[PDB]
Amino acid sequence: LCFLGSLAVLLCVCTERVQYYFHYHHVTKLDEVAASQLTFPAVTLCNLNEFRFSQVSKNDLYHAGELLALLNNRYEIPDTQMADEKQLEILQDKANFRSFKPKPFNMREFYDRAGHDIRDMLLSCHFRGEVCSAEDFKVVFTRYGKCYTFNSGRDGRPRLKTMKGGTGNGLEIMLDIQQDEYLPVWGETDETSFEAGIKVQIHSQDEPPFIDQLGFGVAPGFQTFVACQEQRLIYLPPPWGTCKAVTMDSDLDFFDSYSITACRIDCETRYLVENCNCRMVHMPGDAPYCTPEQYKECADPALDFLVEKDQEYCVCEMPCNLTRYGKELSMVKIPSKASAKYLAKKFNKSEQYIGENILVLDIFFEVLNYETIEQKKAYEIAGLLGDIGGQMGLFIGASILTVLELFDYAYEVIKHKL
Amino acid sequence: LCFLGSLAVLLCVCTERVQYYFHYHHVTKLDEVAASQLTFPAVTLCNLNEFRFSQVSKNDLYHAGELLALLNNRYEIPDTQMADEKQLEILQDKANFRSFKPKPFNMREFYDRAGHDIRDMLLSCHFRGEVCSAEDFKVVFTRYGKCYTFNSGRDGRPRLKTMKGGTGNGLEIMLDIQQDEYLPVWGETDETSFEAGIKVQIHSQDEPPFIDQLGFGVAPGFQTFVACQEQRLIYLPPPWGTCKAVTMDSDLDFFDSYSITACRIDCETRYLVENCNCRMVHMPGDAPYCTPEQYKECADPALDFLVEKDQEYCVCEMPCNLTRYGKELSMVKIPSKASAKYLAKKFNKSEQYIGENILVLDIFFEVLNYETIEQKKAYEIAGLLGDIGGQMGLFIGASILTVLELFDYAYEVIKHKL
Amino acid sequence: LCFLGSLAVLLCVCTERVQYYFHYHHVTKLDEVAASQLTFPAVTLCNLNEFRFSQVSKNDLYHAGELLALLNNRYEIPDTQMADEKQLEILQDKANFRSFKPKPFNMREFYDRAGHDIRDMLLSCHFRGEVCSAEDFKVVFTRYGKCYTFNSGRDGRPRLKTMKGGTGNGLEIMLDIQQDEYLPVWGETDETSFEAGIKVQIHSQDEPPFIDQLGFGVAPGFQTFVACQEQRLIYLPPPWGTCKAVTMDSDLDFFDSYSITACRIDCETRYLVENCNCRMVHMPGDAPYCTPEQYKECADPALDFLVEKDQEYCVCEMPCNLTRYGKELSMVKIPSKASAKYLAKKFNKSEQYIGENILVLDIFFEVLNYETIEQKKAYEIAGLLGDIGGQMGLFIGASILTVLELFDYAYEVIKHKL
Amino acid sequence: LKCYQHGKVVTCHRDMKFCYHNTGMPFRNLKLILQGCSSSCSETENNKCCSTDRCNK
Amino acid sequence: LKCYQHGKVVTCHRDMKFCYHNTGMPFRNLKLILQGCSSSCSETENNKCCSTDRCNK
Amino acid sequence: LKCYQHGKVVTCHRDMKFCYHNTGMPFRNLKLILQGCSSSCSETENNKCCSTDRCNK
Numbered sequence A, B, C: 001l002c003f004l005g006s007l008a009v010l011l012c013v014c015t016e017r018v019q020y021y022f023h024y025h026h027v028t029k030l031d032e033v034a035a036s037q038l039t040f041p042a043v044t045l046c047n048l049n050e051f052r053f054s055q056v057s058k059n060d061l062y063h064a065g066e067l068l069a070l071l072n073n074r075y076e077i078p079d080t081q082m083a084d085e086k087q088l089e090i091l092q093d094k095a096n097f098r099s100f101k102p103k104p105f106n107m108r109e110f111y112d113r114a115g116h117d118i119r120d121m122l123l124s125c126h127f128r129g130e131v132c133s134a135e136d137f138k139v140v141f142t143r144y145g146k147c148y149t150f151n152s153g154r155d156g157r158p159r160l161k162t163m164k165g166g167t168g169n170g171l172e173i174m175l176d177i178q179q180d181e182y183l184p185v186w187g188e189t190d191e192t193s194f195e196a197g198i199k200v201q202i203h204s205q206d207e208p209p210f211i212d213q214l215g216f217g218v219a220p221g222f223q224t225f226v227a228c229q230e231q232r233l234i235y236l237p238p239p240w241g242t243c244k245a246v247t248m249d250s251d252l253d254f255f256d257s258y259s260i261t262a263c264r265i266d267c268e269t270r271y272l273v274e275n276c277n278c279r280m281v282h283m284p285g286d287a288p289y290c291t292p293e294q295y296k297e298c299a300d301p302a303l304d305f306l307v308e309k310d311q312e313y314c315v316c317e318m319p320c321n322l323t324r325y326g327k328e329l330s331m332v333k334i335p336s337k338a339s340a341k342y343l344a345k346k347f348n349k350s351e352q353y354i355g356e357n358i359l360v361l362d363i364f365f366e367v368l369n370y371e372t373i374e375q376k377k378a379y380e381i382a383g384l385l386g387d388i389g390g391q392m393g394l395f396i397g398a399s400i401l402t403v404l405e406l407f408d409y410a411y412e413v414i415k416h417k418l
Numbered sequence D, E, F: 001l002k003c004y005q006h007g008k009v010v011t012c013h014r015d016m017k018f019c020y021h022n023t024g025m026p027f028r029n030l031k032l033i034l035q036g037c038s039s040s041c042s043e044t045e046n047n048k049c050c051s052t053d054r055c056n057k
């Protein structure tokens, strides 16, 4: 008469508390682990120019004059007008094509000798005081051309570590960007880039570099202290959140580990091989890097459809071992009026060449910290029965033993009574 | 004898747990919603100069020579000494006042033709590849003078969207700041500004721009990639937190939606109309923009009292649908030595004019994310009775049914016993 | 027969819930307290040069010619070759040592008159409109040489406050870095610094400045708006987290309050006094600042062992009243083409001297906020018995009164039965 | 405390005390009209530092 | 929804509807081959906008 | 572990093992005096790598 009227008050609170479980709510927890060892993040860096000017020949101009965006489709200097006299004299001399016999061409060979060698870009690599050198930089290939990578972790070299904060305990790279050997830009295209600097992306060792869409820039003539603070992320598998937590062999067709950057490159490789069996030089695989004349029919518009679709054509999900890197720039003008005539004498260069083509990166951890942000499921199964008993211990008083002995009550109802 | 001694142990734990409710504690939850569509934030931008030099006339100098901070109160060139010869020749020629008859004046008309037109500031507006134009910029008025606004959302044009990350999928604005036509600064005042650059504030569509107190700066001669990461905030109404969550008609005397920026402008309009019935040109309302001679008596010191009070004179509270925008700058030197003689030929300008008066903004989303930080009340009313029953299920064992049937116990005490 | 079989189901859930207490898990809570008064953070600033060139004498060159990194160990100009003619003429004239009698030397006296005086560095200090002056800067000593400190809070001057946001309500310091009087760098050492700018660290009043390892940089010729947003941190004592929360007298051998920066200086003072009873001029204590010839035997390598150990030699823990300061830079080019000939006339300097040696800091709070991040223990002792009773109110139904009256059950078992 | 500001009801900050009204505080060649929240009264001629809600009318 | 992408199973975003397959969309002097997740169908000749899992084979 | 540093008691990091004392490690034309927390012992002559609390006296 009233016990029926309190069971519905229990049934309403029990139904909302079992539906509160089916929301899969989650809270997040932020720590600051004062760690003692930290692995150095892999710094990559690309010049903003793709091919240097003083190291291209006649056959490179004959075979890829339109891919260089320098020549006419009927093989001439198209807008050779009011640019320069020293650039124009060397241009028509290496674009004569007067009985110039062609040669066997290979695009991967073209990028290995017409990009930017690190032996004349870099001037002084450092690490915590001990003198870094030139062969610590694993060469990589991405869309800006030839790009290098400090602290890669592959090809046998171990992952370097750091154990002290402060500006004196990281890289100190005095680069040189060589603005004289940029491409002449007397034409006009859609991909034209007037700038002159270095794009640098700081990432962990597992992701391949993606300078096109994640890297900042560093201007020449300005030493930029770039601090860091290593974050760690732990996301949850579905239906709590989203993970590709199954790491046996998810999508690693050309890599080993899974990452949101390596998804898009593996996407754009598998899409292009399904169109004309090509791949560009920044595309890992086994199908051949294809001929320059074949690039203009199939390989060019198949990828320029991708930058026009106005959606991410190939989707995927983030993993849940993500380690980002938060950064905080600052700038100090490098070629001082006290220090002008020493750098011009030492590196055997002009005076005005110093104030335009000298860059000093400086990357270091600020405080040896660890900012972990993880997701934890907030209403587990073991808290369900623990919170199903707060109200039945209050409303009716009945334990489940009163229901467990209610089975032993039923022996006197079906056997003895009927 | 002991049941009285365990009820006080219940009463102490119950009193602290009902006072824990009256603290109104709240925890906060951080997500990363991997969204697929994102609305572009409304970029506004102001030059750091208020009135251009080559487009002021005799009557503008006669009527507002002291508001321009260029003339004497007895109508002369006050400190015309050792500034320039080309500036001084054109100055005294447009400040002769030899039988120069005055004209009807209007301050709103003065700011529409002596500010900075966007047709000669802007050179190339872009959006995801497709070519933006000049008439997408809604003109606004704030304290730096004439200011423009990309992606306003008002006046019929819809809110633009983006669906891809990376640097190639946002604005690419090659501005031009025209340092030649700044005001001559041979005088000295308290408002003197030696700088020359653009102030740019990124905000959502509902707040009016507030460049005076929230915008960063972008230097000329440096293309600055400005990343973004859209945040969402949900605050709680009082007494949990603070909101003006009642959005029927709170304070929208000249706007439609409520925001912490639009509070202060609506404050400073309603204060000044209660003093001399004026308003400046950056003040929305219906009272007339008042005469320049009337500005010097009433309108100038009534607002300069506001910057001297050493308190925010007009207070309000933040709303709880706030969407901020976190930013991360980076700089790359624009006018390259390869790209010098093309920009001077194309835009029909000098060589040294390029390296001083060319700015390239570049604003883009980094990863299509959504960092929501909301406040949730941590001890609701429905958790009070759920946690009032943990101890009485442990201390005394008594359910509330033992109190609910204690009413049926009272029938045998007042009716049958007495 | 079954009550024994449900007690083990209770005992498993009770053992995990008492071990969940011994994990000492903790969640963290983020607020945004819209405060009304905020204390201004103490800005320190150092030039990147240690000793000015035009204020060193013969005996300073005779006594510390090798500590200046300018002279030969056999007292000559070592690499006086192809640097300059004006620098080299004044160098050999103040390095003659032809019957130049020595003098009494003191290193603390050398840094007080050969550093950088603030009376000719600073040009215009401001604070909210009212004109700041030169004697508000408490002189401090750190590793870059002579350094100054705005808003120190010591020596009787109170802590200044601010109550409004925006760019017009903080410092506006038009500094001057004097690149002409830097040290000549025609030699080459390991500590060589080619740069020329100011390092500025924003910190609270209790920590001493630590410009070597925490400060950013500001380039000359660029006015940099530096926003701020005051954070507050509350960490927990062990075994929940880590604190030196006992603040009676923890390690304050030369200071009063405890901080992670003041730990390392107190470390490096107490280590060096245990080696040769010296201290450098940036080391607080009572032992004498020792002679320059004594620095070369003991004081130099004892500290250069510290920068080579590849570990933080002296460890400590963070306190739990930490107030950090998050920053967000932006740059605007200062010496405008309209404003060139006024600054050269006013400060009595050249034209090209303006565009190289003028810096304008500008530090201000953005919005008067308070981002507090505190740690709270998530499973206290008073929640243990509250959650030990959810299952025994569900599994067996037995309250602790059924165990409390089980003591009164035992009176009939040991007294009357046996 | 929810007193007025030129015809709009506006709550104060919870740290802030009594609000006020003033047809005074000359400060220049002028006679100002002020009204808002405050934390310190200086009642000489018209500074109605009343600590009641909606007092400034 | 967990349909294919060139031989790899890949879940879509939870806001995203039916996926599709296309040996078409010429767009240049070419005949493209597309396959992926989507939110709007335009079935004229081969746009198999099927809302079932693993439909694109 | 809470061993000494030149006359001040200081706890180590919870990842860090036994601490030590050394009137050695010459490294230059000098004979250093070191004392602090550590994680690797190299006991040859005086490196007292004792894993007890307050051991360095």
Ligand SMILES: *[C@@H]1O[C@H](CO)[C@@H](O)[C@H](O)[C@H]1NC(C)=O
Residues within 6 Å of the ligand: A234, A320, A321
């Ligand atoms: C992945 O995350 C788990 C859980 O945090 C961690 O134990 C494991 O080491 C991580 N694996 C890699 C390869 O980083």
Ligand SMILES: *[C@@H]1O[C@H](CO)[C@@H](O)[C@H](O)[C@H]1NC(C)=O
Residues within 6 Å of the ligand: A348, A349
């Ligand atoms: C130094 O530069 C000059 C100028 O071009 C050149 O002649 C000389 O060979 C250079 N020296 C070296 C070692 O490259």
Ligand SMILES: *[C@@H]1O[C@H](CO)[C@@H](O)[C@H](O)[C@H]1NC(C)=O
Residues within 6 Å of the ligand: B234, B320, B321
């Ligand atoms: C305001 O917030 C509520 C709750 O988050 C949301 O549903 C609503 O769309 C928001 N309104 C506006 C106009 O943004």
Ligand SMILES: *[C@@H]1O[C@H](CO)[C@@H](O)[C@H](O)[C@H]1NC(C)=O
Residues within 6 Å of the ligand: B348, B349
């Ligand atoms: C280009 O600049 C020159 C130099 O002032 C000027 O005479 C000419 O009219 C300009 N051309 C155009 C189209 O404005």
Ligand SMILES: *[C@@H]1O[C@H](CO)[C@@H](O)[C@H](O)[C@H]1NC(C)=O
Residues within 6 Å of the ligand: C234, C320, C321
């Ligand atoms: C230290 O922290 C406590 C707790 O937050 C606070 O009450 C106290 O004022 C702080 N002390 C100092 C000196 O900042």
Ligand SMILES: *[C@@H]1O[C@H](CO)[C@@H](O)[C@H](O)[C@H]1NC(C)=O
Residues within 6 Å of the ligand: C348, C349
């Ligand atoms: C201004 O500079 C000149 C150039 O050196 C100098 O002769 C003159 O004394 C300076 N004036 C003052 C007041 O210092």
